[PDB]
Each structure stands twice: as C-alpha cells, then as structure tokens.
Amino acid sequence: SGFRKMAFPSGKVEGCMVQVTCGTTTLNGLWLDDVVYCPRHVICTSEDMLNPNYEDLLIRKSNHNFLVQAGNVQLRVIGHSMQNCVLKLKVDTANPKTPKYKFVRIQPGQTFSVLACYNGSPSGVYQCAMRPNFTIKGSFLNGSAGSVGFNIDYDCVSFCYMHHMELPTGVHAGTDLEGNFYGPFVDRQTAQAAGTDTTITVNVLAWLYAAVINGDRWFLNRFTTTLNDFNLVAMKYNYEPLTQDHVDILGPLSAQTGIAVLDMCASLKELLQNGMNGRTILGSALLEDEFTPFDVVRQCSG
Amino acid sequence: SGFRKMAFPSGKVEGCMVQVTCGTTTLNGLWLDDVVYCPRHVICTSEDMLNPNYEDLLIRKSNHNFLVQAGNVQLRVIGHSMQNCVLKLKVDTANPKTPKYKFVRIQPGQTFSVLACYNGSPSGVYQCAMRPNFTIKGSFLNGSAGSVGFNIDYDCVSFCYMHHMELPTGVHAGTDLEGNFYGPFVDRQTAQAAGTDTTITVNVLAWLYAAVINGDRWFLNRFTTTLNDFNLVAMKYNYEPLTQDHVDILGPLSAQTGIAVLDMCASLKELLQNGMNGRTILGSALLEDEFTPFDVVRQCSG
C-alpha cells in the first residue's frame, strides 16, 4: 500500500545521454545507434535566438563545429541534418548501450518520466503529465535543453519528449523526437504564452480510486449521476469533459473497488461544489490530476 | 524554474538488483562484489513469521536452498551468514556492475530515493523522507522486500535503507544495510505500531525558500521572531523544534533570497495560526516537509 509520484527506472536512458557543444552553447543530446539527437538551437548564439533563420545558420556549419562527448570519450561527427526542430548528428560509433526503443507522440493527459540532465550528465528523474495546453510543469534550469521524457513498455523505451525551452510563466515546452513541437510554440525568443490550462478529469477519477484502494473513503456517497449532468458541472470548474471512452478506461478500477464510475462522478461533483472542508485525500488537500488510470493500476496492483 | 519531487537516477542501482528464492519465498537482493544482501525473513515460511527463531531456521539450510537469479543468469551460492536482520549470501561471481558505494545510516528528516523492485526487477523510483518516528511513507506491494533506498554523492552510491515490511497503518519499516532496524521494529508478525509522527520543521522552511525562489511570495511578512518564541508555537502544532544548527543549514537559501531565517520563521508562525486561506504554495495546499535544504539547493541552483 501507499501511493507516490513514481517514475520509471532511468538506467536504460542514462546510457544514451551525451553532451553536445557548438560554439559557446552546450546542451544535452540523445545517442541512439549512430545518431545523436539534440535541439536545433544548439547552433544559435545568445543573440541568434531573437529571430533565427536555422537554414542559414546550419549551412554555415561543418561537422567539426560540433563537439559531442559521451563521458570522457569524444564522438566524431560524420554528418549532420535538421529534422523539423531537432538536429540529427551522424557519429562514427554506434551506441553499444542502445536499448530497444520507439518514438511516440503522446496526448494531453498522459504521463511520462523526465530524466533531467546537465552537460550530458543525468541529475534527477521525475514524473509529470502533458497538460491540456501542451506544456509540462517541469523542473528545469538553464542548460537542461535536450533532456528527454520517456515511458518504459516492458523492455522497450518509448521516447515521447525532448525539452527545448521555458516559457515566461515558468512552464516548459518541447518536441516529440521527430522535432515537432507540442503545442503552438516555436524555438525562438518571442512573446509566446500558453493557453488556458484545464484539469484532467479522467485522471482525477483514477486518483480517487487509488484513494479508495488505500482506505480513504470519506468522500464517497450513495448518489449516482449521468455523464451529461456531471459534464455540466465539470465545465463550470474548468474540468475536461468526460466521455464514454474514459468510463471504459476506468473499468478495471471500478471492478476492483466495486464503485461504479458514475457513482464516483457523483462524489467528484460534491467535492467540486463543497471543497474538501479541511480533509485530505492520499495526503493532498487538492484534487490531483497527474496520475492516469494506468499509473494507478501499475502502482496499486502491479 | 519549477519544483518537483525529484529522485536520483537509478541506473547504478538497477545493475545490482537480483531475485532471491528460498523455498516458496522470493524477494529482492542487492548484489555488490561477490555478496548478495537480502532480508533474513526470506528463510521463513508463511507460518514461521508468527514467531521465528532465525538461528534455528538458518542452521537447517544449506547453500543450495538459496536460488539467486540475476536476470537470466543463475548465481551459485558459495556460503551464507546472517548479520543482524540481513542475510549475506556469498556467490561465486563478483558483480561486474558494482558501483562505488558506501553503507550509511541516515537520520530522521533526511531524504533518499527508493528503487521499488519485484522478483528482482526494478519497477519504479521515488523520493521519500525518513520520518521522525523512523518509518517511511512508501509505496510498496507484496514482494517488494529487499528494495533499497539510496543517495548519490558525486560518483558514489550511498545505500541507506533496505525494505523489510509494511506496518498495519500502511507505512513501511526497514533496516540500514548492516541489518539494523530503523526504529523499534522487529522482522516478525506482531502488533507493533509506529509512534507519533511530527512535522520536520527545517524541511518546511527549506520548501518555503524554494517557493520564494520560484516567485511565490504571498505568505511573507515584515515581522521577525526569536528561536524561542517560534519553538513555543511549533510545539503546539506538532512541529519538530528548531535549533541553531538548522538556522546555519538554511544559510545558503537565506543568502540567495535575502530573507533571514528568523524572518521566514515569522511567516511560518503565521501560516500555522491562520492556515493557507485557500491559497497554495508551489502547487500544494499543505505545508510540505519532505525536501531538505540540500534537496532545494540541488533543484533551485544545481
């Protein structure tokens, strides 16, 4: 029993992190087979970020402008190319620690682990969710660009995120591993802001089920409700609307606890309209929305 | 910027986890050089736990009663011995992935990362604190015994915790790596309960500094207070008393923010006497006490 913000073990990813230096800019890269992936703004000077033309900046570089370091070993750059917002650096040595991997793009509301890195060196691991406004509420300092987010699926590392920048509000924006941004952001210094964030309703419900499984029951009630009456209240409190697919996804947790989804929705409706009244749920005084149904099952069953 | 519950990268520890089977009991072990460390209750049957005599149970075993598996490889047990509440299994092969390591015993209020494992296989990583009552609020299912807690100190893994059991209240108890329990617990099924937990005051203060660094300032005030007047209020709310050593430890955060410790204590005194009034601090509606001053510096400076 117990319930924690749990990340995937990072060992398989740690062996792929490298340092990439171009000019006076150094950040992190991901070394898989004989390719190093890193944010394309490594080729920018401190002044280039105001309004970069990456095609021009790249043609003015050659392979020897790129210093790639894997621990103490130097990797020789053999070729380079740009794919959307990522640089692909071909190197002379294939990473012998290359795990089985996939590149996947995730959806808002899904979670992943982040391996925060500096100078190519892993510093910490934490769990977060892709927000409905396509930002993540990460923890990143200057130099963390190129850090990656991932899930582990049996033996296979699914890479889903590469960090590029922090927005003025203190949240974080990045790309998938094909270089395509999450959300309407660009890798240049402007006045971009994130849109309105909402609460991930299916995740809040999954977490209430985790609470019941761990013996927190004070918020349950006898009432039930319909999908339509719930969503009407959810809209008023900035909660994502709830669909029949969400209900199906929560099935395993409903089965294990004997509490129907629409019954749990009635409890959620109550907590939104009355608050928590100084009670807590799994050690929190707010409703948590960064655990998926799958996260809960993994932690409360195996 | 941002602030997360951040664990250490687990790669160096993942390479040391093995599965240990004795009879029908299988749990996790830690394989360092040519020794596998695991909880001694692996030698107990489901009925032995009621009142075990470990000296008797161990003399009735031989090396071949112990099945040690490192992935697909079988490790041959060459000898065994008991050290306090841990078994030391001598094996024929030294772990080639043995990191530089130390065995250290930690103090209440200190934090560490936990690599939760099942059947010798790493499942997740999370951060927690040793509570003042010598329990940890972990997340563990049946079969997690032998999972370890650790800190990373530059290149060196400091092992500080091995998991043994869950108490009736849902919290967790274990030993250091020399087999000595944290707290007044024993590895046998009785009616042991944890004593009263208190809030780790120096950690709450460190976290308020992390909030200020990240732009949360609404709880600050002009007042100041003395060590003695604060501790009088702290006692009433079940907070650990605050000492001059704590003040010194918080120095770097006071320096970086320009807010003196005793000034921050005055803000804490206010939050205890009036509550948070529906405001949050770093995304929490409760005062968090599981980040040390060192955790904050690591995350908010580097």
Is residue B163 within 8 Å of B144, Cβ to Cβ?
yes
Decide if A124 and B7 are in contact by the 8 Å CB cutoff.
yes
Please give the span between the terminal C-alpha atoms of chain A, in angstroms, as a whole number.
11
Distance of CA A33 to the CA centre of its chain: 24
Instruction: Name B212's Cβ contacts closer than 8 Å, sequence gap at least 6.
Output: B220, B257, B259
Identify the residue whose tokens are 């203060």.
B205
Is residue B117 within 8 Å of B147, Cβ to Cβ?
yes
What is the C-alpha separation between B195 and B174, in angstroms, rounded? 15
Instruction: Name A14's Cβ contacts closer than 8 Å, sequence gap at least 6.
Output: A115, A122, B9, B11
Q: What is the DSSP letter of B283?
A: T
For residue A154, the chain B residue with the least C-alpha distance is B123
What is the C-alpha separation between B7 and A114, in angstroms, rounded? 11
Residue A137, Cβ density class (10 Å: 0-12 exposed, 13-18 middle, ≥19 buried)? middle
Q: Cβ atoms within 10 A of the Cβ of A243, count?
A: 13
Identify the residue whose tokens are 């309703």.
A201
Return the H-helix or E-strand segment holding B126. strand B121-129
A115: nearest Cα among A144, A86, A77, A154: A144
For residue A118, the chain B residue with the least C-alpha distance is B302
Which residue from A7, A128, A172 is facing B7, i.e. has the nearest CB? A7
For residue B2, the chain A residue with the least C-alpha distance is A139
Three-class secondary structure of residue A296 per DSSP: helix
Q: Cβ atoms within 10 A of the Cβ of B107, count?
A: 10
CATH topology of domain A201-300: main proteinase (3clpro) structure, domain 3 (1.10.1840)
Cα-only R_g, chain B: 22
Three-class secondary structure of residue B205 per DSSP: helix
B270: nearest Cα among B210, B212, B219, B205: B219
What is the C-alpha separation between A27 and B44, in angstroms, rounded? 51
Identify the residue whose tokens are 């997740």.
B124
- Report resolution (Å) to 1 decimal: 2.0
The alpha-carbon gap from B8 to the nearest alpha carbon of chain A, in Å, equals: 5
**Residue A166 with chain B: CB contacts under 8 Å:** 1
Give per-residue burial for B197-223: e unless 16+ CB within 10 Å, then b: bbbbbbbbbbbbbbbbbbebeebbeee
Interface residue of B6, B214, B281 to substitute, partner A, most A CBs within 10 Å: B6
Structure tokens belonging to residue B13: 């520890």
Pick the CATH number of A11-91 from 3.40.50.1820, 2.40.10.10, 2.40.50.140, 3.60.15.10: 2.40.10.10
For B268-273, the CB contacts below 8 A with 24+ separation are: B268/B201, B268/B204, B268/B205, B268/B208, B268/B230, B269/B225, B269/B229, B269/B230, B269/B233, B270/B219, B270/B221, B270/B223, B271/B219, B272/B233, B272/B234, B272/B237, B272/B239, B273/B233
φ and ψ of A115, to 5 deg: -100, 100
Q: What amino acid occupies position B116?
A: A
Name the experiment that determined this structure: X-ray
Identify the residue whose tokens are 């922090």.
A166
Instruction: Name B151's Cβ contacts closer than 8 Å, sequence gap at least 6.
Output: B8, B111, B112, B113, B157, B158, B160
Please give the span between the terminal C-alpha atoms of chain B, in angstroms, as a whole number.
11
